[PDB]
Amino acid sequence: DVIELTDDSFDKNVLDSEDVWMVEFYAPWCGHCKNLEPEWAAAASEVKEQTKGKVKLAAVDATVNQVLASRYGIRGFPTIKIFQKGESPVDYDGGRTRSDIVSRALDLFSDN
């Protein structure tokens, strides 16, 4: 489903991975993040089904993982960043529909 990542777990999970990671950085009081939670989970199920985990969806609570928040310049919420092997992350620029997120995921899968 959605993997919860932390300052301590991020680099081995994500940076050292052969898989692509789409990571939502959120704050726990942020209503837009709360609204997105169920759609993020739904997208994560479909992506898992389509890619068998070659693309993973994850989340980071930026407020308690401040090394990551600083590293990736998180200045607002929610912020979704896409990580591919050996690259700096890029920002996701689509909507929260399942089709939008799954489209980006399959694009990533095709080329990874």
Side-chain angles (χ1 to χ4, degrees), residues 65-80:
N65 293 289
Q66 305 194 1
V67 172
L68 292 173
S70 177
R71 186 197 285 177
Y72 297 119
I74 305 301
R75 63 87 34 192
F77 315 107
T79 287
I80 299 157

Side-chain angles (χ1 to χ4, degrees), residues 7-33 36-57:
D7 275 354
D8 286 357
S9 78
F10 192 92
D11 292 358
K12 178 44 183 68
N13 273 273
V14 178
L15 300 185
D16 298 337
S17 185
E18 310 286 1
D19 303 324
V20 176
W21 289 74
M22 296 179 76
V23 179
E24 173 205 3
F25 290 83
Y26 68 97
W29 68 77
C30 166
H32 292 248
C33 300
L36 161 58
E37 185 172 29
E39 273 286 75
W40 199 238
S45 299
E46 184 170 10
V47 173
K48 182 194 76 196
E49 187 61 14
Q50 305 267 153
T51 72
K52 285 191 82 107
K54 179 68 78 203
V55 183
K56 300 191 156 69
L57 274 61

Side-chain angles (χ1 to χ4, degrees), residues 22 40 43 57 92 95-105:
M22 296 179 76
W40 199 238
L57 274 61
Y92 173 59
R96 297 159 192 161
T97 77
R98 202 186 213 180
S99 307
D100 286 347
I101 293 158
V102 173
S103 182
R104 186 55 170 122

